[PDB]
């Protein structure tokens, strides 16, 4: 409701306790944020689950072979443990933010550039062993503190085919299998293993993702659930389809986690307003309408969803700003009509507003939509 006031989120009724019997409520954080007093209060008050926005990624963990950097990751694990929060590990395997040393042969050449089958099969086994060693060191350190793991991120392509990353080119599908088997082997039967991707609703990828996980489970590959990043917009995808997607995977026995939730003010591509003060109040009512529908569907499907995690804490920090391109006509007036004329774009220079918390840490229309029981 829009009559409900813009009160401080440190005073608002606690978001995790409202959903505590349906799924955990998480946020993606950066280690600098555990040094900001307002973010610490936000995390303490409102969330019971946590994930590293960045520092647990392949390049953050092992930038050179043998150089393991856990100081940052540790800082998050410590803080969650201190405040009884669940941890997700994002992510063990990815085609972005992954050091290039993974994919070089013994003479340091791009393993992809090899033509020899003999040298190709060699590079594959080397890549798989580098992977098992990467997963191994991480999992051994964190197995008793990090329950939920994004083993692989974003491996199915949007074209319905497996993403042709160096992983896929060099090692074929087996890099995926080696990934989940490594995590299970060193972390044991108590950590949960997920495959994590975006557009898990959009076809052909959705059923591509469905086929891949089904075949892998049929092959004994240990994968416990699906992660839906859920970088969505106010109107799309439909709650209908979201439900069809969560229903599909739950049918195979897989858990579902909303892993990177943010509701964008914009479309695709974004035509973003240049500042926060520049977004009209009505967009905040559209967004709250969606969050209400969205979180009602999450609650109906609570027995199929174990966690819901936003890709940030409050509107003052969201990676969505990097996609917030601002469009300027010839007279230099901002253009936000998706088809209107324009002359220049300033990429990543704009502001988005995706969370239920505004950049001054006061509750948005969206917070009230999901905190009530209507
Ligand atoms: O800070 C940025 C970070 O927020 C971003 O994280 C990805 C966002 O899209 C998905 F949810 C991925 O799994 C995340 O890893 O990546 C770029 C980084 O600079
Ligand atoms: Cl970011
Ligand atoms: Cl504000
Ligand atoms: Zn709490
Ligand atoms: Zn960030
Ligand atoms: Zn405000
Ligand atoms: Zn509601």
Swiss-Prot record:
In terms of InterPro entries, this protein maps to: GH10, GH10_AS, GH10_dom, Glycoside_hydrolase_SF
Record's protein name: Endo-1,4-beta-xylanase
Induction details: By xylose.
Location(s), subcellular: Secreted
Keyword vocabulary terms for this entry: Carbohydrate metabolism, Glycosidase, Hydrolase, Polysaccharide degradation, Secreted, Signal, Xylan degradation
EC annotation from Swiss-Prot or TrEMBL: 3.2.1.8
Q: Where is the active site?
A: 154, 260
EC class, as a word, reads: hydrolase
Q: Which organism is it from?
A: Geobacillus stearothermophilus
GO cellular-component terms in the record?
A: extracellular region
Q: Which family does it belong to?
A: Belongs to the glycosyl hydrolase 10 (cellulase F) family.
Q: Name one GO molecular function term.
A: endo-1,4-beta-xylanase activity
